Each structure stands twice: as C-alpha cells, then as structure tokens.
Design a binder for this molecule. Structure first.
Ligand code: PLP
Ligand code: PLP
Ligand code: CL
Ligand code: CL
Lengths: 278, 278
C-alpha cells in the first residue's frame, strides 16, 4: 500500500498512489530539476522530520527553488500518514520541482511506500560495496556551485547507474571517490568508519551531502564519550578500519562487510552505533 | 498549444497537455532515471527524426532501459503532430523512463510545444556564453561508464543550474570545460568553431554527447568542400577562432558573439553554415 498527497491551492490533497500527478512538461521529469528528502516512517511517526525539512530548505536554496515552507510539508506528511499502518515501516519522500518554469508555481508532493524487505535485510545482515570514482577533485565542487554539491536532487541517474554497475560486479552499494582517491559518500548514504577508538566521516567541503543520520550518530557519540572526527580518508582507511557503515534516513545503519571483494569484520562495534541511533 | 501522447498497451494515446501523465513513483521523476530526444518540428514534419531515434536507442542502451522501438516512437510523434499547425515551429521531446522499476514496463511519451520566441531570437541574432568547468578530466568518462557520458538523460539539474549561473553573469548559455581546460560541449548543444579554413568540433571520446546537428553540418561541409576536423580545442581556440556556434536540434545554429565577456565576430562564415544545415 502506497499513499500520495499533492500541494494544490495552499492545501494537501490525497490522490490514489496509481494516479498520475505530474504533467509531461514538469521540469522535475524533463530535466530532473528538483530536490527531495527521504523520511523514515516508524510506528506511524516521522521521528526525524525536522532535520529533513531544514535540509530541504538548503537544497531548494542551492537550486533557486521557491519552497512552500515547514507547515506545508508537515500537512502533506500528515495527509499520507492518515491511514498508514503503525506496524509497517515506511519511506516518505518529499519532492519539490521547478514545475512548468520559474514563474509558474513549483510542484510539491509527498509519497509514502513500505521500506522493502531487501533494504530491511541490508540493515539486519549488512552489505558489500564497490569503490567507484566520480572523476572530480575533492576541492573542486566548493568553487563550482553549478555542480549542485551539497543538494539532494532528483538528478540521480548517475547515482543509480553506479549502483547497477556495482550490482553487475556482485556488490550491493557504492562508495564514491574523488580523483585523488578521497572517500566522498554513497549514492544515497554517508560513509562512517571506526579506527583508533574514533568514529570518522569525510568532510562536507568536498561537495558531498551533509547526512542527517551521520550527524545524529556523531551528536549521540559525543554525549556517550565516543570520540568523533571529520577525516579526509581514502579506500585504504576502509580496509584498515575496525568497522565501516553506510548511514541513511531509511535503510539506517548498514554494516559494510566487503569492500571491493575484501571481506572485513566490524570489531563488534555495530551494537553501540545501533544503540546510539535508537 | 501543446500536445502529449503516452505509450499505453502497445498504442499511442493522445492526452490533454495539462493532464498529469506520470505517477509520484515514476523513477524518471524521483531519480531522473530516463533518457530523452529533442526533435525539431518544421512545417508540420520531423525532418531529422531517424537521427534522433538511432541516438535514443544508444542512450537507452547506456542506461539499460528497454526501449519500445522505432515504430512505437513514430506512432507517438504522429499522434502529437495530428493537429499541429504547419506554420508553428515545434519541439517534440521523447521521454523513456525506468518507470516503477526494472520489471514493470518503462514509461514512454511524446510531448510537443512551440519553440519559444526567445530561442528563435537566439537563432536569428546570436548568443553570449560563459565557460564553466565540469571538474572532470577529458579522458575520465571513457573509463567510468556509471557517469553516463554519451547519454542524453533526464538528469540535467546541473545542465540547467550552469545556465542559470551564466544568466546571473549576463550570459545566454554555457560551454563546459574539462579539468585541463579542454572544450567539452554546451548543456544542451554542441560547440563548433571555424579556424584556418576548417570547421572544428571537440572529440566524443571526452564523454560528450555525439550531436546530430554537428554531424549533419560536417557531412554537408564534406560534400561542399569545407574541410572538417575533430580538434581537442581549449577556450583559447574560441577567442582565436574566425567564428563560434552552438548547434542543437531545436535552436539550430546559434552564433556565439561573446565568450566570457569577450565580444567576437563570425568572419561572415554563418551564412554558409546555415545554407549547409538547410
Ligand atoms: C540522502 C543522501 C544521504 C543520506 O542522508 P540522510 O539524511 O542520512 O538520509 C547521503 N548522500 C546522498 C548523496 C544522499 O542523497
Ligand atoms: C541534445 C544535446 C546536444 C545537441 O544534440 P543535437 O542532436 O544536435 O540536438 C548536445 N549536447 C547535449 C548535452 C545535449 O543534451
Ligand atoms: Cl534516497
Ligand atoms: Cl534539450
């Protein structure tokens, strides 16, 4: 079961999930010209909705998209949650597109579906990853705002193509690397690794997305006395680590048990990461 | 006036242009996971449709998208052309999306609208361009098929953001450059320049789109005795040229009269380019 709400004349309107909602001329379809958020629905609630709404505002600023505001998104989330089963974990995505062009109103909607069994299983049992190069220097995106570094966009054909290429090798997911070999991020997730008693993540100044799940782990780790660091790591760091995870709003913490075909353990560190994220 | 046809149960179905046609869960919207072609409609005909359909097949191969075949696209084009005025120049776009996922059928449609007055005016009176870096080495995409070099995709948020950044400087359009400074292409067009009595264009091995308009110019130039070359040019070549154009299916030949604020003439070469493309 799926549910959709569209923002129409200053209100959220529920529409059947199978019914078309975007026209052929919507720039979100034709040019991938829009932004999104992926929000976890757990026990019929959105525990981290505000974190996603703040970043939605930031992505929309980067693309010069007029956003309808927090109250509008909360009305749309409420509309899709109305009849959602508490026992069924969901992914609520929020889309904002440029619409028919800058002048006509942007298209805003909410769409809710179950988290699939295979994503839940990756959370339970972990993932293999392939390292793929993005071809950009680590320092380049900071000086090239047209590359939309730091924006969560609808233009993810490359993100998905990287995952299909990894699937062809036998891997579940991807860690992107800069031209120099620096770790960037996953196509839809943030890389964290444990070494020397510290939790590490790559720096945002490389033009990656600031991940909300990573930020929440780091905040909890500080309160608990687990040191954290922003570290310009390489693939060598993932092999040498005590543990590696990909973090994201919906899948959550996926332990990385294989890097480019090199199997690795987690030093029994995943338990404390999961307790902190709970 | 606009017209849309959707591919439904092995036939083209005309729908009103204002009516929604894609659901919230279409991967073409949510991930920009699809390909397109932009086809000129002139005097109620598509003079170069076959060129676009061959490349559509190539883009779909790069993204692993099952394509409905030439006959299907010609039925969809015919459907949108049915009541189109011969006196009104049009842009017919063809979209193929991954649909609800690899397993459910891809979404295919055709959408036709007038070429806007401002695009026609760029064809008539020419354009200013800004040079912007893509941050990738010229040779990188050839070894990184997940970057979808050479595919005409729906994931063009960066393409459009580059144009808005150029608009902010006072420029009409963009020429992308490799990390080394090599000319790549426009966000939606192919760069050609004249120097030493030769027509030049950048090589496709840099991961650019092979442009159909550029190819057709080069073929006609050979028949007419105007030498052509694939040349790994830089921005220096555009300043030093006798003439510069951006070429594309819909806008056609747009003479570049300004590069990064440096005004330039065309050596009265545009006339022969236009005669060859006619
Ligand atoms: C969404 C996303 C993430 C993960 O961020 P969360 O806020 O933890 O969901 C990381 N990188 C990319 C590229 C993403 O799109
Ligand atoms: C469509 C397009 C072109 C132009 O190709 P034509 O076949 O001449 O329309 C060039 N570069 C990019 C990136 C394009 O999308
Ligand atoms: Cl996502
Ligand atoms: Cl285009």
């Amino acid at each position: 079961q799926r549910s959709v709400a569209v923002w129409r004349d200053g209100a959220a309107v529920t529409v059947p999930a199978h019914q078309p909602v975007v026209t052929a001329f919507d720039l979100g379809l034709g040019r991938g010209d829009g932004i999104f958020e992926s929000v976890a629905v757990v026990a019929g609630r959105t525990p981290h909705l505000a974190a996603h709404l703040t970043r939605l505002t930031r992505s929309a600023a980067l693309l010069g998209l007029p956003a309808p505001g927090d109250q509008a998104w909360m009305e749309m989330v409420a509309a899709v949650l109305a009849d959602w089963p508490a026992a069924l974990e969901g992914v609520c995505r929020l889309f904002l597109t440029r619409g028919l062009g800058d002048g006509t109103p942007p298209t805003a909607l909410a769409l809710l579906a179950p988290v699939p069994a295979d994503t839940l299983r990756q959370r339970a049992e972990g993932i293999s990853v392939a390292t793929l190069g993005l071809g950009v220097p680590a320092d380049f995106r900071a000086g090239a705002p047209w590359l939309l570094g730091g924006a969560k966009t609808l233009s993810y054909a490359v993100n998905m193509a990287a995952q299909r290429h990894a699937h062809d090798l036998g891997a579940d997911d991807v860690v992107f690397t800069s031209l120099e070999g620096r770790l960037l991020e996953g196509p839809t997730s943030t890389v964290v690794w444990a070494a020397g008693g510290t939790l590490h993540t790559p720096p945002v100044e490389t033009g990656i997305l600031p991940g909300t799940t990573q930020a929440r782990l780091f905040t909890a780790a500080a309160a608990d006395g687990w040191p954290t660091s922003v570290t310009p790591g390489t693939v060598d760091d993932l092999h040498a680590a005590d543990a590696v995870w990909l973090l994201s709003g919906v899948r959550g913490a996926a332990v990385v048990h294989t890097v480019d075909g090199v199997r690795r353990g987690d030093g029994d560190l995943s338990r404390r990461v999961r307790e902190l994220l709970a």
